[PDB]
Design an enzyme around this catalytic site. Structure first.
Site, short mmCIF file in Angstrom:
data_model
loop_
_atom_site.label_atom_id
_atom_site.label_comp_id
_atom_site.label_asym_id
_atom_site.label_seq_id
_atom_site.Cartn_x
_atom_site.Cartn_y
_atom_site.Cartn_z
N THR A 75 65.96 47.57 -24.72
CA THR A 75 64.36 47.40 -24.74
C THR A 75 63.68 48.89 -24.37
O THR A 75 62.68 49.20 -25.12
CB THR A 75 64.22 46.68 -23.47
N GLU A 100 43.42 69.02 -19.82
CA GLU A 100 43.00 70.34 -19.93
C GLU A 100 44.64 71.06 -19.97
O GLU A 100 44.79 71.89 -21.00
CB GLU A 100 42.37 70.87 -18.79
N1 LIG Z 1 66.09 57.00 -13.78
C1 LIG Z 1 66.36 55.64 -13.93
N2 LIG Z 1 67.37 55.21 -15.08
C2 LIG Z 1 67.54 54.01 -15.20
C3 LIG Z 1 67.24 53.03 -14.23
N3 LIG Z 1 67.61 51.93 -14.78
C4 LIG Z 1 68.30 52.13 -15.68
N4 LIG Z 1 68.48 53.52 -16.08
C5 LIG Z 1 68.92 54.20 -17.09
O1 LIG Z 1 68.40 53.63 -18.38
C6 LIG Z 1 69.44 53.55 -19.30
C7 LIG Z 1 69.66 52.24 -19.76
O2 LIG Z 1 68.40 51.28 -20.00
P1 LIG Z 1 67.97 50.46 -19.21
O3 LIG Z 1 66.37 50.79 -19.04
O4 LIG Z 1 68.77 49.75 -18.19
O5 LIG Z 1 67.54 49.23 -20.35
P2 LIG Z 1 66.63 48.08 -21.10
O6 LIG Z 1 65.44 48.86 -21.33
O7 LIG Z 1 66.61 47.02 -19.89
O8 LIG Z 1 67.25 47.69 -22.41
P3 LIG Z 1 68.23 46.23 -22.29
O9 LIG Z 1 68.66 46.00 -20.90
O10 LIG Z 1 69.37 46.76 -23.43
O11 LIG Z 1 67.44 45.09 -22.86
C8 LIG Z 1 70.57 54.43 -18.81
O12 LIG Z 1 70.33 55.53 -18.99
C9 LIG Z 1 70.28 54.08 -17.02
O13 LIG Z 1 71.12 55.12 -16.58
C10 LIG Z 1 66.38 53.33 -13.19
O14 LIG Z 1 65.94 52.61 -12.35
N5 LIG Z 1 66.02 54.61 -12.91
MG LIG Z 2 67.70 45.66 -19.60
#
Ligand SMILES: Nc1nc2c(ncn2[C@@H]2O[C@H](COP(=O)(O)OP(=O)(O)OP(=O)(O)O)[C@@H](O)[C@H]2O)c(=O)[nH]1
Ligand SMILES: [Mg+2]
Ligand SMILES: Nc1nc2c(ncn2[C@@H]2O[C@H](COP(=O)(O)OP(=O)(O)O)[C@@H](O)[C@H]2O)c(=O)[nH]1
Ligand SMILES: [Ca+2]
Ligand SMILES: [Mg+2]
Lengths: 69, 440, 422
Positions: free
Chosen positions: B145, B254
């Protein structure tokens, strides 16, 4: 200078519109290609699973034929 | 007017959003229900915080934000959580099934079922704005996503809002917390696809945040809550410009003028100081000169790279709290004489500086000490390219054998989009080389 | 909710499935009536993945029990938890298969298939958002292996875009004397390579060897073999069953684990077999803790999942998994970066304070396919017992294609084993 001012603002509006049009078109060509392609792969998957049902007819037939010897 | 709408996509975008909105509420004295006693105009106003918050007749202050995920569980936690009252249900949009770490599913297969609905809800927020300035889009590079739905949305946003500014906060993957082997693929695809549609993107390297939590906060194994608490201070530093005003405050747009010399060169390196535990802050005044120096220590950077081995095209310093000009000047004097700060020859000057008098805030039960004064530096260095080189390398090692490519092809992509995205990133690595070479 | 539909077929399939349901029902704190009599909410958060609700807050396995032998349906019903299953989901033949695959796949299995299918649909159509199917079965018998595969094709046709996951019990001369098993296993594998997304190779060879050599068990029963299998099954489904980040559904798991569509056969692993984190970790990568009878040191890992359960230090886990990959760098393909993932669930299994479950996609799995292939080619060369299959309508050609498709798969694993970053 007044007519150059008109041209410059006309050029900005035109580039902006263009950018919107091209993005609109790129996007809808990508969604079409993606749909054909996906559907096509599902199609092929099902044709292959078919030919399995046509082999399983031709097996169950093969059997009732040797079972009148 | 001068409203900004924030769009939070996927788990990372969503959780970071929570962290930010809690922080913004504490910074402005907004309560979990949305009431804000110190706000005497009811039902509206044009105060600085109204760039991020609308107001209902009932005196509710409501984030100008949309949260979107293809799966409900992360957003359900906002719906039932501390801050559920803050949002209107229609700002919290969920599907039933996720992208499964697959860009193709986020952009096409699952994403297309929900994109029209998302643009609708965004449209309802734009219509409540007297003079919309732009979007802030929060998402991971690595999730399906985060990568694929976000780039679809950015494309569609360029169509419905023209060239209205779109800024990104992007989580760049790290092995300690990553959830998928194909994160490099999703990273390159979304970057390729988003590049023309974004005006400025702040990358946050999860490894860098991870390290800072371990080193400077003595957190043994940092969680996403540790990380997001840190990230949100950085985001708050960046947005504070907009949500507050004061004589020496300097607006994000800016800084942008100075940070983007060329449309594709729009990825600033962020650094933030101080990051310190309460235990170590006790009886320790970190002066303006100390926090400024900390900005040029590569281990306080939010992307791992080495600016000492690159060239600067811009330095912007966003001070907050108890800071006055005399001290900033001295601090910068010191640094110019005693550091490796090489600017390209087409940017003779140079540094740009602002101060927000409002003091930094921390969340209760957090690991961050409350300090009197803080700084965020945004610099445009050619060293941020290192981050792309590393991803690109991971991409190539897999793509050469087409590892996992069949997961993308079965959802409708072609190998041609992979090679095209990768070519675009080769070019971007070349662009960061060219800008840094001296003129003739 | 992302629902899974379980299907157990044949004697093996039903033995292990029942075990699986006992075990996890215990983990979620539900008794043989179907009531939650438990302590914590972690237990019910994702219970829909495997359990339907009924009123009177009952929980009913979303499960479909299938055999051509009518008897196995009673042993199940009488077993503990037998009364928790849905009675209409029992779907029995009368004839029985007598270890002839073509009976299960092409004739007597085909008669019965439509009515299993009726149950599957019924179950699928109540699902908020079906993720897919998991089938328990053996590849040596005739129902579980032959009808089992026919179901797979049949389901894959009505649900092509859902994930299809097998627990396939591989046959060993050490466990069953039934001379014809290498035919049924080869023909099943032919099917599985084309029609499953992910398959855990549960090997009777290795389950014997762990029962004999490690556990000090001089002659082991199915009940001992399956004690291992249920520990494994519980382990590899921990990520699907409780809150977590890594591989939380069948598709994210397939995506992390399967870099090439045909190369989807996994070595599971468990530890301790019957500790400190460094011991768990070293053990789970040992050839001796592998539920498939392959030596990882004879191939290279394309990908790995690793799951720790218990109250432990996550820092300690992180360092140890780093340590293993470093000291063993040669046995992980270099051209798939960060190909080992790790999860930690606070809830240990029953009786253990901490355990480790492993899931590898190693190219050394060709050792298992070669062993079968030898056995199979012992017979087919001197067209032995073939009349059981030509009998039910088959041609020899099919036996051949099933052969050169399994050799093809072996040579593909080789090909990626041999490949370098340049
Ligand atoms: N910094 C941070 N990274 C996160 C968090 N949750 C997931 N990640 C990172 O995000 C990446 C994974 O994508 P997600 O954002 O979990 O995935 P999604 O956008 O929900 O996509 P799908 O689950 O595949 O539908 C990995 O690099 C994780 O380490 C968070 O709360 N903070
Ligand atoms: Mg997800
Ligand atoms: N591990 C294990 N293997 C089994 C079990 N029951 C049968 N098998 C194996 O399954 C194969 C025979 O298949 P079975 O389920 O009995 O055949 P079917 O029921 O006609 O499909 C043989 O290789 C057996 O050793 C069991 O409970 N546990
Ligand atoms: Ca007001
Ligand atoms: Mg049988």
């Amino acid at each position: 200078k007044r007519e150059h001012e008109r041209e410059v603002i006309q050029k900005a509006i035109e580039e902006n519109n263009n950018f919107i049009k091209m993005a609109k078109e790129k996007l809808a060509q990508k969604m079409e290609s993606n749909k054909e392609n996906r559907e096509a792969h599902l199609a092929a998957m099902l044709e292959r699973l078919q030919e399995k049902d046509k082999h399983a007819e031709e097996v169950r037939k093969n059997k009732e034929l040797k079972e009148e010897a | 007017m001068r409203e900004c709408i924030s769009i939070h996509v996927g788990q990372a975008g969503v959780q970071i959003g929570n962290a930010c909105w809690e922080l913004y509420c504490l910074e402005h004295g907004i309560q979990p229900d949305g009431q804000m006693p110190s706000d005497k105009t009811i039902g509206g106003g044009d105060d600085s915080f109204n760039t991020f918050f609308s107001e209902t007749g009932a005196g509710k202050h409501v984030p100008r934000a949309v949260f979107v995920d293809l799966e409900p569980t992360v957003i359900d936690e906002v719906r039932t959580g501390t801050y559920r009252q803050l949002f209107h249900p229609e700002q919290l949009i969920t599907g039933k099934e996720d992208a499964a770490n697959n860009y193709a599913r986020g952009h096409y297969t699952i994403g297309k079922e929900i994109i029209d609905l998302v643009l609708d809800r965004i449209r309802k927020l734009a219509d409540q704005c007297t003079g919309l300035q732009g979007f802030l889009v929060f998402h991971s590079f690595g999730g399906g996503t985060g990568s694929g739905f976000t780039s679809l949305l950015m494309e569609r946003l360029s169509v419905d809002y023209g060239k209205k500014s779109k800024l990104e906060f992007s989580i760049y993957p790290a092995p300690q917390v990553s959830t998928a082997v194909v994160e490099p693929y999703n990273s390159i695809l979304t970057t390729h696809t988003t590049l023309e549609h974004s005006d400025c993107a702040f990358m946050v390297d999860n490894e860098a945040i991870y390290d800072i939590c371990r080193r400077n906060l003595d957190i043994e194994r940092p969680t996403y809550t540790n990380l997001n608490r840190l990230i949100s201070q950085i985001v708050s530093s960046i947005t504070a410009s907009l949500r507050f005003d004061g004589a020496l405050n300097v607006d994000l747009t800016e800084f942008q003028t100075n940070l983007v010399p060329y449309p594709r060169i729009h990825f600033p390196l962020a650094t933030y100081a101080p990051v310190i535990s309460a235990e170590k802050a006790y009886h320790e005044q970190l002066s303006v000169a100390e926090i400024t120096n900390a900005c040029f220590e590569p281990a306080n950077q939010m992307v791992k790279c080495d600016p000492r081995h690159g060239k600067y095209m811009a330095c912007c310093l966003l001070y907050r709290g108890d800071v006055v000009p005399k001290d900033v000047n001295a601090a910068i004097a010191t640094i110019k004489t005693k550091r490796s700060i090489q600017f390209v020859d087409w940017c003779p000057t140079g540094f740009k500086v602002g101060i927000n008098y409002q003091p930094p805030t921390v969340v209760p039960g957090g690991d961050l000490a409350k300090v009197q004064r803080a700084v965020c530096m945004l610099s445009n260095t050619t060293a941020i390219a290192e981050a792309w080189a590393r991803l690109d390398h991971k991409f190539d090692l897999m793509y050469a054998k087409r590892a996992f490519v069949h997961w993308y092809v079965g959802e409708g992509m072609e190998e041609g989009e992979f090679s095209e995205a990768r070519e675009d990133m080769a070019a971007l690595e070349k662009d960061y080389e060219e800008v840094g070479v001296d003129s003739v | 909710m992302r629902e899974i539909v379980h299907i157990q077929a044949g004697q093996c399939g039903n033995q292990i499935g029942a075990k699986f349901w006992e075990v996890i029902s215990d983990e979620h704190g539900i008794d043989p009536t179907g009531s939650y009599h438990g302590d914590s909410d972690l237990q019910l958060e994702r219970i829909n993945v495997y359990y339907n609700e009924a009123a009177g807050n009952k929980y009913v396995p979303r499960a479909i029990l299938v055999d051509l032998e009518p008897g196995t349906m009673d042993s199940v019903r009488s077993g503990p938890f037998g009364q928790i299953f849905r009675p209409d989901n029992f779907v029995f033949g009368q004839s029985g298969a007598g270890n002839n695959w073509a009976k299960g796949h092409y004739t007597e299995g085909a008669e019965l298939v439509d009515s299993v299918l009726d149950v599957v649909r019924k179950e699928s159509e109540s699902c908020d958002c079906l993720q897919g199917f998991q089938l328990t079965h053996s590849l040596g018998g005739g129902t579980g292996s032959g009808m089992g595969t026919l179901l797979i094709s049949k389901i894959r046709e009505e649900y092509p875009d859902r994930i299809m996951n097998t627990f396939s019990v591989v046959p060993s001369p050490k466990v069953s004397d039934t001379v014809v098993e290498p035919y049924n296993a080869t023909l099943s594998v032919h099917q599985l390579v084309e029609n499953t997304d992910e398959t855990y190779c549960i090997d009777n060879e290795a389950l014997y060897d762990i029962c004999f050599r490690t556990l000090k068990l001089t002659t082991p029963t199915y009940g001992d073999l399956n004690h291992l299998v249920s520990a494994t099954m519980s382990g590899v489904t921990t990520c699907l069953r409780f809150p977590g980040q890594l591989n939380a559904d069948l598709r994210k798991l397939a995506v992390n684990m399967v870099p090439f569509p045909r190369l989807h056969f996994f070595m599971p692993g468990f530890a301790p077999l019957t500790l400190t984190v460094p011991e768990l970790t070293q053990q789970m990568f040992d050839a001796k803790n592998m539920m498939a009878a392959c030596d990882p040191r004879h191939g290279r890992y394309l990908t790995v999942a690793a799951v720790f359960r218990g109250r432990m230090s996550m820092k300690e886990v992180d360092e140890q998994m780093l340590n293993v990959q470093n000291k063993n760098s040669s046995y992980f393909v270099e051209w798939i970066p960060n190909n080992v993932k790790t999860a930690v669930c606070d809830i240990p299994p029953r009786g253990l304070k901490m355990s480790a479950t492993f899931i590898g996609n190693s190219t050394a799995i060709q050792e298992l396919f070669k062993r079968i292939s030898e056995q199979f080619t012992a017979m087919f060369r001197r067209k032995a017992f073939l009349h059981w299959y030509t009998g039910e309508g088959m041609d020899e050609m099919e036996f051949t294609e099933a052969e050169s498709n399994m050799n093809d798969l072996v040579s593909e694993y080789q090909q990626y084993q041999d490949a370098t970053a340049d």
